Design a protein around this ligand. Structure first.
Ligand SMILES: [Ca+2]
Lengths: 14, 345
């Protein structure tokens, strides 16, 4: 799992 | 001085229940479905829903016959999703895509109820808390969860309500390939017989942890800022092939010990928050595939000799594609050593 505040950073690399 | 113009956030269109999903939206719409699953721990009464029946202790391997009320099972659900291609152009296909699940177990602080019918821990003490072999699991996918049947003591006689893996041998206590199934019925597939198949679940994402001991504590976090990403190596999540989202879980949270000592299981419900979006995909099945299913549904069914499977009668299939310089080996053998011969011992 991962925190919510880094969620646009994780999806953004695709 | 003055402040600045506020930050662009996504524009909420409708909040509500299950009949809210069918809004005709645009292409870049994203929906967030929130749901739960009750644990099917056996439920021995209408008065005691959430526990299991009391456990048997020491019956033999050749004389083991559990009942359905003492077997925790898997929870599963299908979430119907609306069709998405009604207003787009032609030759343009587009399905759902689970991007992110945010899960959580409801009811975890209820284990602090030590003044219930628990066992007295010492001479003047509180109740014994819930502790024992727990198991926490959840799966999110566009297909039903595909199972694998492994169970110790293959001579256990299961009742009619449970669909346990049929024809067990001594190889069912180890990996046996002939026990494939789907998780397609609630409160039917017991947890002690079925693990999720690690070779077949390409369109689901399952996560499972368990700590199996005589007395281990259930350590349970509860947080609304945690987030599980469901995307694969290519950047796609579980695609909803049929317009359906399959959600399954199994949360065993230890052994409740009664006043007389008679232990029984206890499970808790599991929250799900799936973040969906609209993935543009390619149509796999043109009208050539679609016409050929009509001829399938009109051809006479022959019942002949076994031309497929284990007992097949097709001896050899060659497949040719292009041209090649003439090989000096007319039986074009690929494996330089398939059997293991001419190796050093
Ligand atoms: Ca595979």
């Amino acid at each position: 799992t991962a925190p919510q505040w880094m969620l646009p950073l994780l999806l953004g690399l695709y | 001085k003055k402040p600045k113009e506020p930050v662009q956030v996504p524009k909420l269109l409708i909040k509500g229940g299950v009949e809210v999903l069918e809004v005709k939206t645009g292409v870049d719409a994203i929906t967030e479905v929130e749901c739960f699953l009750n644990p099917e721990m056996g439920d021995p009464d209408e008065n005691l829903r959430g526990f299991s029946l009391k456990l048997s202790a020491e019956n033999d391997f050749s004389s083991d016959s559990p009942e359905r009320k003492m077997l925790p099972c898997y929870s599963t659900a299908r979430i119907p999703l609306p069709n998405l291609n009604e207003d787009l152009t032609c030759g343009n296909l587009l399905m759902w895509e689970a991007v992110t699940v945010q899960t959580e177990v409801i009811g975890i602080t209820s284990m602090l109820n030590l003044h219930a019918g628990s066992q007295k821990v010492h001479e003047h003490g509180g109740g014994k808390p819930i502790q024992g072999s727990n198991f926490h699991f959840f799966a999110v996918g566009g297909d039903p969860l595909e199972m694998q049947g492994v169970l110790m003591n293959y001579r256990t006689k299961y009742p009619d309500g449970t669909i346990t893996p049929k024809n067990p041998t001594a190889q069912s206590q180890v990996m046996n390939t002939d026990h494939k199934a789907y998780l397609d019925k609630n409160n039917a597939y017991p947890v002690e017989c079925w693990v999720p198949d690690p070779s077949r679940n390409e369109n689901t994402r399952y996560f499972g942890t368990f700590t199996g001991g005589e007395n281990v504590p259930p350590v349970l976090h509860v947080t609304n800022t945690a987030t599980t990403v469901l995307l694969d190596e290519q950047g796609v999540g579980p695609l909803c092939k049929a317009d359906s989202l399959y959600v399954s879980a199994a949360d065993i949270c230890g052994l409740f010990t009664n006043s007389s000592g008679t232990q029984q299981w206890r499970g808790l419900a599991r929250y799900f928050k799936i973040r969906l979006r609209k993935r543009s995909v390619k149509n796999p099945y043109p009208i050539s595939f679609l016409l050929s299913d009509l001829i399938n549904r009109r051809t006479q069914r022959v019942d002949g000799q076994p031309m497929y499977g284990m007992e097949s009668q097709v001896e050899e299939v060659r497949v040719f594609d292009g041209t090649e310089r003439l090989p000096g080996d007319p039986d074009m053998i690929r494996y330089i050593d398939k059997q293991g011969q001419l190796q050093t011992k």
